[PDB]
Amino acid sequence: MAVQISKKRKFVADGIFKAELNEFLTRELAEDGYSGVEVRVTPTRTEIIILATRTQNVLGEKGRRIRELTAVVQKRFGFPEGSVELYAEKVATRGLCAIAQAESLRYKLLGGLAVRRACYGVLRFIMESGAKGCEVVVSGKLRGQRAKSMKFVDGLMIHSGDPVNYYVDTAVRHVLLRQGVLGIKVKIMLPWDPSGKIGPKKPLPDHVSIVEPKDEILPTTPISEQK
């Protein structure tokens, strides 16, 4: 770069890069249980951290797939030789991640399991994992040539105002069967977690809580006490 690009173009181009990388990884690592990518920079080096539920499938027999993925990421995005490193990392609390639950429901349906038996199978596992509530939806040609939908729901679920940006986790997916495409949508509502990264640290806007009064003595008589 013989003269540097302006800050408006620089900040937009850095966002366009993260979007294409997330699409490539989404469709390479679908059955391997992918759920997100994180990227960080240091002098002469870029480190990419990738989250999945079955990390040994991301590596392969002696690390083959990490070496193949390092090669194609460098080849496509134009990094110089050896400046790119890929690290696989294991997903914590996989029942509270909406993308891993949308993909496992997609592969469970694609194997020929019945729709209600599959949907109550994930609805139980999300609520046993410690969510405050959830909503699962399937739609398309469910049983016959005319389209239908099903809602499955449990616990609490908010729809309006700013808290939706940090208390609700969501995913949408497609599955192709011999008669055409079905849609899947998954929503999960997270628990409040003061510190520990199960959920958000910020409380709900209308949850006031009062501290309890303690240990007073009702009677008194006048006395003095020297040190």
């Binding site: 409380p203 806007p205 209308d206 006031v208 009062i210 501290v211």
Partner: protein, 68 residues
């Protein structure tokens, strides 16, 4: 117009008075400071509304019983 107070305000004010009656009085600006240290309230604008109805209830309790 409309100045009616919702159940989130009216319930929090009653629970404060049941526990801390001996701290409270008729000055809004002192009640506003007490309610900030005895409770966790997410918004400054909600804290002002709670201390307002607490100040209204203290002036009623000085005359006779309040059923709640």
């Amino acid at each position: 117009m409309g100045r009616v107070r919702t159940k989130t305000v009216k319930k929090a004010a009653r629970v404060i008075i049941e526990k801390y009656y001996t701290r409270l009085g008729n000055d809004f600006h002192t009640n506003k400071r007490v309610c900030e240290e005895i409770a966790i309230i997410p918004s400054k604008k909600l804290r002002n509304k709670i201390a307002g109805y607490v100040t209204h209830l203290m002036k009623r309790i000085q005359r006779g019983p309040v059923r709640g």
